[PDB]
Amino acid sequence: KAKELREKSVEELNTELLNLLREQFNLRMQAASGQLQQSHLLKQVRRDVARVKTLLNEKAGA
RNA sequence: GGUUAAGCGACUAAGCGUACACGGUGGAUGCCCUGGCAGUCAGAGGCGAUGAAGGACGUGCUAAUCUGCGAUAAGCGUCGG
Numbered sequence: 561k562a563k564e565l566r567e568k569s570v571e572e573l574n575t576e577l578l579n580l581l582r583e584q585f586n587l588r589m590q591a592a593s594g595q596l597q598q599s600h601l602l603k604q605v606r607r608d609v610a611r612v613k614t615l616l617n618e619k620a621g622a
Numbered sequence: 623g624g625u626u627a628a629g630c631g632a633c634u635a636a637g638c639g640u641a642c643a644c645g646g647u648g649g650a651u652g653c654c655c656u657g658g659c660a661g662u663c664a665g666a667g668g669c670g671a672u673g674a675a676g677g678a679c680g681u682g683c684u685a686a687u688c689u690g691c692g693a694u695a696a697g698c699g700u701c702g703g
Binding site: 596603609610611617618 | 698
C-alpha cells in the first residue's frame with residue numbers, strides 16, 4: 561500500500577490518516593460490544609495507520 | 623466289652639517371630655541431555671546528554687506469564703536474500 565500512498569501529498573495523507581483513525585474507533589466500538597466477528601480488521605487498520613505515519617515522517621523533510 | 627483309679631497326652635493364637643509370594647510407600651541405581659566447567663583459534667574491547675546500564679507501565683482476536691516491541695507499540699519504510 562505504501563507504493564500507492566507515496567503518490568498522495570501531505571494533505572490528502574492527513575485526511576487518509578484521520579479516516580483510518582475514525583475507522584479504528586468504529587471497529588473498537590463493534591469489537592468491545594462483542595458484535596465484530598471479523599477480528600482481523602483491527603490489525604489491518606492499525607498497520608495502515610503506522611504506514612501513513614511513516615510516510616508523513618518521511619515527507620516531513622528528514 | 624462295662625465302671626472307677628493311676629500314668630502319659632495331640633489339637634488353641636488374643637497377638638507375635640522367621641521364611642517365601644504378592645503389594646504399598648519411597649525415589650537410589652542404570653541410561654539421557656536443550657544446562658554447566660575448563661580451555662584453544664579468531665573477534666571485539668566499550669555504551670552514554672543523538673539520553674546509556676537497569677527498570678516501571680503498556681502493547682495481541684488475549685485472562686496471565688515469558689519473548690519481542692514502544693502511543694507508528696509480537697510492530698512501519700527501503701534495499702537484497
